[PDB]
Amino acid sequence: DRWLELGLTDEEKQNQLEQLAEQYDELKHEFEKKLEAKRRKITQGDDLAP
Amino acid sequence: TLIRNLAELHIGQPVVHLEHGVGRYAGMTTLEAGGITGEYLMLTYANDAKLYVPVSSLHLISRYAGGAEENAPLHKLGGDAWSRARQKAAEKVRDVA
Amino acid sequence: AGELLGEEQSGSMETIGFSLYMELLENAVDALKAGREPSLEDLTSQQTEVELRMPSLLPDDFIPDVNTRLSFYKRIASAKTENELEEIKVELIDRFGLLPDPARTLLDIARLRQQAQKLGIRKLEGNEKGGVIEFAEKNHVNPAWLIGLLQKQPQHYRLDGPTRLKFIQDLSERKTRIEWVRQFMRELEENAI
Amino acid sequence: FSPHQDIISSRLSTLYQLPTMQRGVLIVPVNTLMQRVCPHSFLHGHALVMKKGQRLSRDALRTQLDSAGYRHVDQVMEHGEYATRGALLDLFPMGSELPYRLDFFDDEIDSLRVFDVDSQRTLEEVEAINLLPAHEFPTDKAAIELFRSQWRDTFEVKRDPEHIYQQVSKGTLPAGIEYWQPLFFSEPLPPLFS
Amino acid sequence: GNRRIRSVGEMAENQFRVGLVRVERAVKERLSLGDLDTLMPQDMINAKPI
Amino acid sequence: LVIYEREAPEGTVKDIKEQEVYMGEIPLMTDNGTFVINGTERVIVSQLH
C-alpha cells in the first residue's frame, strides 16, 4: 500500500514511477464508476413489445 | 479602470442578440459561405445550437445587464418566448412614448 | 438592476437589457417627431450597404486577440471623415506593421461608404460582371447628364427602376473593380447638383 | 500570493548593477536585509544585449526569451511578457520600465523602438537594449528537474492536481512559489552581503 | 472481367443514400416556402425515413 | 443552415445557424464480421452483379 513514493535517483525512472502511480489512481476511478454503470444496466426496467 | 477592466468579449459571459435572444459569446471564426471568407461572431444557445452572426452586423448585439451571469436565461433558438417578450416591451415603450 | 422604465428597481426579473430600451425610446421619438406609425423596423436599420462580393476582414494573423479586433471594427464602422480613416491607417501601421490586402480593402470600402453617404446614394451593389447603383429619396446627381450617360451607353447603363441603375463591367480583378467604382462615383459627384 | 511581480522589476535592476557602482546611496530596511537572495551568477550569466547590427532569428530569440522565462501574451501590458504579430515582436524587459518593438527584417534587428502601454506607437528608437531573466529563479527543464529532486529529497510528494510539486512539474507556477526559492539552486543562498 | 463484387459496405451505403434522398426532397419543398426566420435544422430533418 | 439576404445581390449572409441534428441508427459490425440485429446475429453475403 505504501511503495509508490519511495525515494529514487533523478532520471527517467522517477518519471516512470510517477506515470505508474497515475495509472493506478486512474484504474481505481475507472473501476469505481464501471461498477455503477453495471448496476444501472442491471436494475433498470426492460423495454418490451406492447 | 474598473469599467475598462472589461465591457465586452469574455469567453463565457452572456450577451443578447435582439433578433433571437440571449446566449453566451464564444469567439470569432472565419467561414467561406458563398465564395468569400467572412468573419463571424458565434453565440451558443440552449441544447448547444450555435449561431454565427456576420461581423459587419455587429450593432445588433447588446451586453447583458439582467445580472444573472451564472443563472441567466438561455433562450432556446427558434422559440416564440423572445418574440412575446419583445412585443410586450414594444407595447410598454409605445405607452411611454 | 430592475425596470429601467417601470417601478420596483433593483429587481432580477427577465426584462430586456438596457440599451434596447433606449433604442425603442428613440424609435418612438422618431414616431412622434415625424408622426410616423410605431414599428419594430428602426432596429432593423441600414445606413448604407456597399457590399461588392470581395473578401474584406481583419485576419486574426494580422491581429492576435479578439477584443482589439472588435474595437477597431466598431471604430471603422462608425467613421465620419477620411481623416479618421487616415489616422486609423497610421495607427494600424504602427501597431501591426504593414497592411494586408483585406485590410486595405476594408479601409477603402469604408472610405467609399463615407463618400457615398456624403453624396446621397444608399445602396451600391455589384459582382464581377457588373452591378447596380441605388440612390436616396433626395439625391444630388445631375439628372441631365445622368440621362446623357444613359443614352450614351444604354447597353452598359440601364435605368431599371425608379432609383436603380444597372451597369455591366468585366472587373475580374478586385483592384480593377475598386478603381472602376471609385472613378465612377467620383465622376458622378463631380457634377453634383 | 506573489510579490506583485512589477516590484520585482525595480528589485532586479538594483541587484544587477549593485556590485559595479562607486557613488550612490542604497537604503534597505532590516526586514529585507534578513532575506536571502540569488547568487548573481544566475543573474549575469543570463543578461542579454540586443544590438542593431545582429542577424539573429526571430524564432531563435523567441525561444531564448522562453528559456529566460518570459511569458507569452498577446496584449502586453505588464513586466515580463512578450507578444508577436507577424514580423513585429514586442516585449517588456524586466529591468527597464517601457516595452519595446523590434521590426525584424530578414532575421536582422532593424529597429528597437520604445512605446507606451497605451500609445502602442514609436516614441523613440534606442541603439541597443539589455534584458534580464524574468524571475528570481531559473525556469528551464534543468530547473524543473532540480526542483523536483530537491523536493523528493526533502518533503513528501502527494499525488494531487494542485499540490505544488505536481503543479510545478506540470509547467505552470504556483502563486506563492516565490517562497520556495531555495529549491532551485542546490547551494546555500547568499546573505546579500557578497 | 464484366461482373463486379459488391460487398456489404457499398450496398449499405447506397441504401443510406436512397434514404437521404427523401429527406432532401422534404427539406427542399420546406425551404421553397417562406417564413425561414425561425427554422432550425431539426424539424425539417426527420429521423424516421433514414 | 445559412440564410442569405433577399434585396442584396446573389451571395451574402444575414445570419447563419447550425446544430447537431440526430438522424438514424446504423448497425455496427462485431469483431468477427457478423452484425447483431435482434439477438439473432446475421451476416451479409456479397453480390456478383
Side-chain angles (χ1 to χ4, degrees), chain B residues 20 31 33-34 40 48-52 54 77, chain F residues 2 4 11-20:
Chain B
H20 296 96
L31 279 81
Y40 289 94
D48 299 335
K50 300 172 71 67
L51 161 61
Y52 319 93
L77 189 51
Chain F
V2 64
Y4 294 166
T12 185
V13 174
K14 161 171 165 289
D15 61 350
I16 183 169
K17 48 169 77 70
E18 80 188 26
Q19 80 172 23
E20 198 177 32

Side-chain angles (χ1 to χ4, degrees), chain B residues 6 29 31 33-34 37-38 45 48 51 55 57 62 74 77-79:
Chain B
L6 196 63
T29 306
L31 279 81
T37 55
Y45 283 161
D48 299 335
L51 161 61
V55 64
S57 177
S62 161
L74 190 61
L77 189 51

Side-chain angles (χ1 to χ4, degrees), chain A residues 4-5 8 10 14 18 21-22 24-25, chain D residues 145 148-149 152 156-157 159 165-166 169:
Chain A
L4 67 171
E5 304 83 353
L8 174 64
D10 308 305
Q14 211 78 42
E18 291 170 342
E22 163 58 15
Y24 167 72
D25 285 358
Chain D
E145 55 78 12
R148 295 162 73 255
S149 69
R152 269 174 289 91
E156 311 305 317
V157 59
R159 202 152 53 264
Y165 172 74
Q166 297 297 325
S169 176

Side-chain angles (χ1 to χ4, degrees), chain C residues 101-137 139-161:
Chain C
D101 197 3
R104 300 189 307 93
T105 54
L106 187 84
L107 284 184
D108 54 56
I109 289 297
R111 186 174 304 175
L112 267 63
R113 176 179 57 76
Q114 189 73 68
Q115 298 168 296
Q117 183 165 6
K118 177 263 183 180
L119 175 60
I121 64 181
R122 302 305 92 186
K123 308 301 171 192
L124 180 156
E125 292 64 35
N127 54 23
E128 194 287 332
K129 77 177 196 299
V132 295
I133 309 177
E134 181 272 358
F135 324 95
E137 66 276 346
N139 51 16
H140 311 290
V141 55
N142 177 232
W145 176 54
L146 177 152
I147 299 292
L149 299 169
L150 182 143
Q151 73 177 26
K152 278 164 189 165
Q153 283 203 340
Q155 69 281 343
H156 290 288
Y157 301 94
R158 283 146 61 254
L159 176 63
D160 303 337

